[model samples]
Target: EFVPPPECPVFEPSWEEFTDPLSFIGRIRPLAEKTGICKIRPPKDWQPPFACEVKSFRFTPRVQRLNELEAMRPREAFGFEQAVREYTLQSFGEMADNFKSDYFNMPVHMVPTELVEKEFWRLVSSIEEDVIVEYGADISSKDFGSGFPVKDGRRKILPEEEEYALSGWNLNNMPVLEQSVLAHINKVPWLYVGMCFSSFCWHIEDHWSYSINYLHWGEPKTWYGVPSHAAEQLEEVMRELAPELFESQPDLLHQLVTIMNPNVLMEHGVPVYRTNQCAGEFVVTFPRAYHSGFNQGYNFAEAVNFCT
Candidate 1:
């Protein structure tokens, strides 16, 4: 019998008592700066435990658009959107045929694109209500760019000119505890647009940023990049075929690293962790790491992305 690998214990921190960015900075900055990863333990009875005390900001989901999705940058994997639809149909049909809804929470309906849009707004509204009351923050769609931009030759965003709601709110807009946390601190600014995907792809953001993503209402799953070595090779092949990508993206160098190093992933499989991040739970990622995502059973979820 093949034995399963030992499971590493995942930590769940309490954020109830966290009241400001400074407190979060005090806790996560050191870890982000030194090792690029850390587990936090929040105090007991910290009301609003999911509130991010870090410098990250949350945005409303009012502006999600199908056009944006269609116009967005096409990923290396072609036909992804279509694949998602086909998979949803097959998966849902299987669910009905098996009639095991209780055992598994797989969605039965082919979630309407409009419904997805609605859920995005719903999540933003909740976060806005809580964040405003807790932090006195104005849910201004303006001034959203708060993180570092992907440098030239890095990964390019889709629809090159397609502007994110908060693209302007990058690292230069605010104070960050460390450069590593810029990934988390840097945000796209619109919760509606951000929440559309089940998880992020295996590309690193600019400036060696770190992220602690909190899943408040939807399911988020992740697949880490194939080892760094393999990733390098893939990057080269993809970039060679799509030269425009290299010219437009800021994180091209990081992508190249993945293309040249095929053996790295072969040596060790990328860490694949599946977590149903509860409303109050979150996950953190290090700078320049490769990862991807699959949604939990829920068709929609709400969460905040953090950079400290």
Candidate 2:
């Protein structure tokens, strides 16, 4: 049932051409848009300097039950800070090393991506494997700023931060507020901090915009994607499989974070594509492309929604 679909297209761009990312995205537009998601690797020399202080950077981790079959991110589930009263704040380095020691007993990146995927899907479905993993949910830029540096002139920007600041991938590359309320400022990248088996449910972007993610560090994330054309068909399959989940009055279809087996979607004629998104790589999920994925291990990923 967990048959790996064809790997999504992966692009390796040199330093010279990587600056203008949109053109590169356009060159592979046909194949990339076909699969609904694709991978990007920057040149070997392209290291943007890890600006985050692992020791002192603090965030409240959200604990999720692996057995939860119908879970969405916190916004749809619970009140923001209210949901975290049961937990405590932790630093990035503390959480990462602790998770690694508890699970793999090695460095975070040392674990093979395949084994992590095999174990994650296996544990999530296992009746007895009720291992609860804690993760930092998508903290929007308004509340937590962005993981990337921005060009706002109040603060003197470093040379390394200059490139990331100008890149369209920067969530603050545009204007207005973060994606809160009914505002048009939807460019803020949702920052995620994950340990093993910390999974995101299947969902598309708001307003059917193309979504791009940058894996900042640590291990890779495994993703599954379905094209925009089959979005409704796949929605139909989920409704039929579990009518109770959608019994309430309709919500926006794109925000619905539902996941059935990929085989379930495949059997019903939905195209599913798979990929391993590694550190320093970018993955773009096409507009209306329903996608879901789980982290390989301790990792940081930020995603922003962009429209054409």
Candidate 3:
């Protein structure tokens, strides 16, 4: 059985209350600096400007082979790496076409969530076959238009103004501190489409900045987070479990491929909190806070990194 962690704070402030960016910052800065994770529930009427035309776009999922030990066993147990490499090499057209074919008959929404979870654990547990899951391409606002309004748009919506104001790195909010490469990239929002069990590994933003994520639509996504203050504890556990990974890649956490169960972290005396983020909800991850999650089912989410 899975036991969820403690509840993180969830705030429901009106647009009027948060209109003043600096004032709002003053109130939450302490919590943000400490815990590094929080949630915001927008007003009842608030809605995102999602692009409904996204249904027409085709996506090629990335597959990963979990349980490397099982895959390494001799006697033709499972050629996981080769299979993933071949599938990854296929073009979008080829992959999409194959998805429709009888050979790979998998409808977009028909991808079963429970079955995926079961198969995922099965693959990792047994030495039979490698786990194959669907992880959509990393699409950005440039590829699939942003729901949030651009600066030069028609009327200035309150939500857009609030979003812009809350951004720590925005020039309007802060003076130009030594510019980093992420300064420009973090400005743009990145889109993520997940279908059951698709996950993001634990990681923090570059230079220990903040991140804001919004779920555009679909089923809930489960998150597990550890506060910034407990960051070293989390890293220590990861180092113990995956010494080889940390040995080879000193910056393993930055590369979001290392996934570990939160239960294990809790067992090691690290505090971990859980949350199920639904559509229209905003999840904010503060600097150096380690967080990771998986989609319950099919969902679309947009996130951007910021600094204070």
Candidate 4:
């Protein structure tokens, strides 16, 4: 028997609502400013900007695993310092170079998608061991290019600016919010290739900015999120569970690769919500909201961050 996760809010507004910048702001402001995480089913005819030929771009997948018992525990249970050291020592270049030849033992596209999904959940389903295989988060748009199109001869824009404008996160479309340095870094979308069980760890956007992700193709990506109002509660729980993370880095929250189990947060009395984002769907994370989840099977998704 499988138990589904709790639900988050979903908005399906008319494409007309997004036509005028002010109207779009008026419609999405409440959700974006207050709720922290929501799914938007863009008008039925809306298609994502998907420019690259999937076969042309290739990446090596990184293997990440957590024992079933450990998966249920707070992140500190695994020794944050040791984990950080191990993560820092990982050699992605070496992995990518030998990926096709040594690791996956199969061509990127030929990898069996259905079998991957079955095995992925099996690994994480029990108190045995959970495994995740993920690629990208390092590859940038400059190398691969985005599916979005430029508007009004905007070819001279920066890579980040181009992503923002094409993804509907342009500053001109929404209400003005505080500026963010992270937003600049987030402007260039990162490509993610997931094979069953590959996951993102629990963390919030830097400076509480929003993030929008689009699934280009393949299986759905599952997500768990905690609202912005509960942001402090989520942090307090993390601090209680992984004190070494904060004691040592103090600014660990802003660092990349921070991960914890949402189940642990719920066990500690924090509220969390869940959703499965399929191809062509947009998953948006509100400012300061914590989110984490795993992929169902082999899939490609692109994401970028933005401020107001």
Candidate 5:
């Protein structure tokens, strides 16, 4: 009974158009700025990938703070789910191995992507299945600081990797200090390792700047977007549904990543668009465009902000 909103525009760039990622992104900026969010599928064979078995650092995962214990009925009855929920601290290495042990001994990539997406949305919609939104970036080692070259001791940065580091596509590339910002203030790709159904909430970029996310490898990320033009319209709908959630609480407000159903926004006449971002693809989010997404299965992604 789920009527998904319209599919967001997707760009299938030719080899020439896809040569330089930042260049192609700049080319599409004008069109996507109006659409709020869009997906880009690179030319079929471009694969700049690194194995997931490196980097052994850890950080605190942010609690979604939406529904911490909403589905707990004594907590013990839901044994397996409770177990994982209890031990929230984990690394992608552990998570990747854990997923492999349960996924029928078949490889992660061997599973059908559609099944992952449908099952993910199904679990997300089910109140019994509580979604815990967590992050995997805070303090990385000098060896593996970020997706971009920060300190550059992990290993000599390759030529292509150097090019990416210099790409102004990274928002933090520019020098600025608001003195109070979460991800944008730090000049590095905000990396995360998300499991199936783990989600990000509806929000705008730092100071209404554009964001570009690249999925290193994994299932897929399903995203929902509201055009920048309709920012007020979406907010109005959200406030009407739960006014308490929108009260003035700036610092604490950042953790308020709620699990709002897409239909709710659609019913209120909010023009919502969606897209399933696969591995080897990128999703571009414009300033003032509130967007949210959830992981299909075990996946790692790095995102950075950019502006002209």
Candidate 6:
């Protein structure tokens, strides 16, 4: 379900100070150029309508130790097992907290709509139906969730669906795979499938990693970063100013809010606020920047930190 809007205004702030994307980018380009990270604030009153929101968003909490991949599958080929392990390592290690396994309900809310779905499933099914079949029973089924024990081993609808859903699949690995495959296939540029979610929490992708994000569907918003040089002061400002910032701006806060800490929120920026996705919207983020949705109306939430 979705959170309904309030009848009267619940939060208030002046929109006059909001910056357009170009101006915002120009303001932060120095930082981006210096530290490979920048925060851009889109113009006030900016959002994409028609963005679909899935009901599930789930992922494994951060683990200091690596997880075992031996249980993947017996008949799983060397490459497949290695692939899984590599993916697991990269995801769990580098991008651990950044990923939510499911953003929308899977199977139901996360259905195939884009080209990535067909390609991802094709590869997965091929591995199971074809490759693993010779070894034993299909083990791919067991690999669905990230070994979490919630929701009956099933994923939550909204976040999970968004993760696996066609519209929002992972796209970070396309280039490497393409280059490798091209070396073998003698191809120019293969249409390596990439994925993105319908709605995005205004957080950075893996914090400090190089990334180029595109907005495809749903209303996307961003509270990006300043340069690393200014990061300390800016973060302090964000931390101390978040409450006032949140209280002051309802619409923008309606999309997202922040208040964790000047430091931690700086890592992901404060997400003391956020809004739900509509349609035809999306956002991109760079490394080390903190982000989260502010208010999803009724769907706003905070995850239990299972890692200790």
- Count clashing residue pairs per candidate: 51, 0, 1, 4, 1, 78
Residue range with the least summed lDDT across 10 consecutive positions in model 2:
80-89
Write candidate 6's Cα lDDT for 169-196 as tens digits: 1221112222246669770111100112
lDDT of 4 at 207: 64
- Using alpha carbons, what is the TM-score of model 6? 0.25
* List of clashing residue pairs for candidate 2: none
Every candidate's lDDT? 0.34, 0.71, 0.62, 0.60, 0.64, 0.28
Candidate 2: segments with Cα more than 4 A from true spot: 52-56, 70-92, 104-110, 153-156, 174-186, 243-257
Ranking by TM-score: 2, 5, 3, 4, 1, 6
Winner on TM-score between 1 and 4 is: 4
RMSD in angstroms, all models?
15.6, 5.4, 6.6, 8.1, 5.5, 19.8
Candidate 5 vs. true structure, TM-score: 0.73
Cα distance off (Å), candidate 6, residue 63: 20
Best by TM-score: 2
Candidate 4: which stretches are off by over 4 Å?
1-3, 20-26, 29-35, 53-55, 68-127, 130-132, 150-186, 243-247, 253-258
At residue 70, give the lDDT of candidate 2: 37
Which 10 residues in a row give candidate 1 its minimum summed lDDT?
Answer: 129-138
TM of each candidate vs. truth: 0.39, 0.81, 0.72, 0.67, 0.73, 0.25
Q: What lDDT score goes with residue 68 in model 2?
A: 57
Put the candidates in lDDT order, highest first.
Answer: 2, 5, 3, 4, 1, 6
